[PDB]
C-alpha cells in the first residue's frame, strides 16, 4: 500500500541545490573600473586591472561564511569576456592584468575545485560590444553565444572539478535592429550534452526560475513548480513568486539578492546590515527556496572588508538558530498511515524516515516537548521526494495552560521557518487545513532565534 507520488518530481540536482540553500553571485568587471551597473561595450580593456585579485580568497571566505555554489558573471552587459575566449578579441587577452595571460574563469575554478565549492557562469546573452548583436546577424550572434557555452562547459579545468551546477541567464535584449532572437533551446541542449543535469536558470521553462521579486522574498505560497508555457520573458511576476500549485514541471524560484544597492562594487555603498539579511533568508530560504547573494569585489579585486565581516555575522546568526533543536525527540501524537510513517519519525533526528497521514483533514500533530521550552521559530519540512502536497496549515502552543496561535501559513516545501512572538511553552500542534493529496513531513523542529 505504498504512497503514490504527487505532481512533478525534483531531480536530483534540484534537491541538492534545495538542501545546500546558499549561493553566492560574483559581479567584477569593467564595471568595477568605472564605476557602473551597465557598460556600454566601449569600455577600455586598459582599465581593467586589479592590483591584487584573490580568487582563492573569495572562495574561502564563502566557504567559511555557508556558501554552497558561486556564480560567477563571465561576460556582463558590456560584453567583456573574463576567460581568454577563442571567439572575440573583446577580453581579459588585452587587458593588462596578469601581463595579459589572466583567467579569472581558470583562478576561480581552481579554488573552487580546492574548497568542493560548486560553480556556476553567466554569459549576458544581450551584448553591448559584439558586432554581431544585431536582427540581421542573430544566427551569427547565438552560433557566438554557443561557442563560448561550449568552450567553458567542456573545458575540465573549468568547474569544480570539471562539473558545472548552475548556467545563469536571463532573457533581456535590445530593441529594434537590436531586438535578437535567442535560441534558448539549443543552448540548453549544449548544456545538457556538456554538463548533464546541470540546472539551469533562464526564463523558459528549465530547471530554475527567477523569484519573480527584486528583495528576493518568495510569495505566499511558494510551489515550486510552473506550467511551461506559462513562462519566457513575459510571464508575470506574480506566477515567478507563487509558481502555479498545478504545474507540471519541478522549479526552484530562486531569490537573487545583491549584498548592496547595486550589483558591482561601489565606494558610497555599504552591505546590508545582518538584519536585512536575516529578514531576506527567512522570506527565502525559510520559504523552501535558495537565496543568490551577490557579493562584489572592489577594484583591488578583493572582496571589500565590510561585506566580509557581514557574511561572518550572518554565518554566526545562522549556526546560532539552529544550534538547539527543542523538539529533537519530543513526544508526538496524531494520525499517522503505518509504522513505517510514525509520528515519531517528525523528531527522531533520522534523514531516513518521514511521517504520512491519509487521514480527514485538519490532521493535527501535537508535541509533547516534556518541559517548558522557549522558542520563536518552528521548522517544517514536506518529502519533497514523493512531490510537494501541503497547501495550509497552523500552528498552536499552549501557554500558561492555555491553547493560543503560534502562526499559520500555506506551503512548506522543502523547508518552512515560521517565526511567532516567543513563548515558553510545554506542548505545541501543527495542523494541516489543506493539502493537494495526503501529507507528509520528514521533520518538525523548533528553534529560539540569537
Ligand atoms: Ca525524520
Redesign the pocket.
Known amino acids: 500500500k505504498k504512497i503514490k507520488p504527487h505532481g512533478p518530481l525534483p531531480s536530483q540536482t534540484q534537491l541538492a541545490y534545495l538542501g545546500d540553500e546558499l549561493a553566492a553571485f560574483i559581479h567584477f568587471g569593467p564595471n568595477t573600473f568605472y564605476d557602473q551597473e551597465w557598460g556600454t561595450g566601449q569600455e577600455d580593456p586598459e582599465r581593467f586591472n586589479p592590483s591584487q585579485l584573490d580568487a582563492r580568497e573569495w572562495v574561502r571566505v564563502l566557504k567559511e561564511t555557508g556558501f554552497k555554489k558561486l556564480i560567477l558573471v563571465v561576460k556582463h552587459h558590456d560584453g567583456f569576456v573574463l576567460y581568454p575566449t577563442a571567439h572575440t578579441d573583446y577580453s581579459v587577452k588585452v587587458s593588462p592584468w596578469r601581463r595579459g595571460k589572466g583567467d579569472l574563469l581558470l583562478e576561480v575554478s581552481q579554488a573552487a575545485t580546492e574548497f568542493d565549492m560548486d560553480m556556476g557562469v553567466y554569459l549576458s546573452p544581450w551584448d553591448a560590444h559584439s558586432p554581431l548583436y544585431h536582427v540581421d546577424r542573430e544566427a551569427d550572434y547565438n552560433a557566438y553565444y554557443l561557442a563560448q557555452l561550449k568552450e567553458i562547459l567542456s573545458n575540465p579545468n573549468y568547474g569544480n572539478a570539471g562539473k558545472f551546477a548552475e548556467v545563469w541567464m536571463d532573457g533581456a535584449r535590445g530593441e529594434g535592429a537590436q531586438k535578437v532572437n535567442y535560441e534558448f533551446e539549443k543552448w540548453f541542449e549544449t548544456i545538457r550534452d556538456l554538463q548533464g543535469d546541470c540546472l539551469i536558470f533562464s526564463t523558459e521553462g528549465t530547471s530554475i526560475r527567477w523569484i519573480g521579486n527584486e528583495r528576493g522574498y518568495a510569495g505566499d505560497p511558494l510551489w515550486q513548480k510552473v506550467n511551461p508555457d506559462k513562462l519566457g520573458t513575459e510571464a508575470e511576476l506574480n506566477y515567478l513568486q507563487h509558481g502555479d500549485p498545478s504545474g507540471t514541471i519541478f522549479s526552484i524560484g530562486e531569490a537573487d539578492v545583491s549584498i548592496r544597492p547595486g550589483w558591482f562594487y561601489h565606494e558610497d555603498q555599504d552591505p546590508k546590515s545582518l538584519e536585512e539579511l536575516v529578514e531576506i533568508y527567512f522570506h527565502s530560504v525559510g520559504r523552501g527556496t535558495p537565496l543568490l547573494l551577490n557579493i562584489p569585489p572592489n577594484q583591488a579585486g578583493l572582496f571589500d572588508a565590510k561585506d566580509i565581516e557581514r557574511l561572518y555575522e550572518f554565518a554566526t546568526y545562522r549556526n546560532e538558530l539552529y544550534k538547539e533543536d527543542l523538539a529533537l525527540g519530543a513526544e508526538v501524537s496524531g494520525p499517522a498511515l503505518s509504522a513505517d510513517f510514525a509520528c515519531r519519525?517528525?523528531?527522531?533526528?533520522?534523514?531516513?524516515?518521514?511521517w504520512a497521514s491519509d487521514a480527514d483533514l485538519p490532521i493535527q500533530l501535537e508535541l509533547d516537548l516534556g518541559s517548558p521550552k522557549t522558542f520563536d521559530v518552528i521548522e517544517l519540512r514536506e518529502d519533497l521526494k514523493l512531490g510537494q502536497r501541503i497547501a495550509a496549515f497552523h500552528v498552536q502552543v499552549e501557554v500558561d495552560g492555555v491553547w493560543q496561535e503560534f502562526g499559520s501559513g500555506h506551503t512548506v516545501g522543502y523547508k518552512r521557518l515560521l517565526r511567532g512572538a516567543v513563548v515558553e511553552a510545554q506542548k505545541i500542534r501543527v495542523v494541516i487545513t489543506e493539502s493537494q493529496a495526503l501529507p507528509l513531513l520528514?521533520?518538525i523542529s523548533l528553534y529560539k532565534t540569537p
Do not use: M, P
Open positions: 519519525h517528525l523528531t527522531d533526528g533520522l534523514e531516513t524516515s518521514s520528514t521533520k
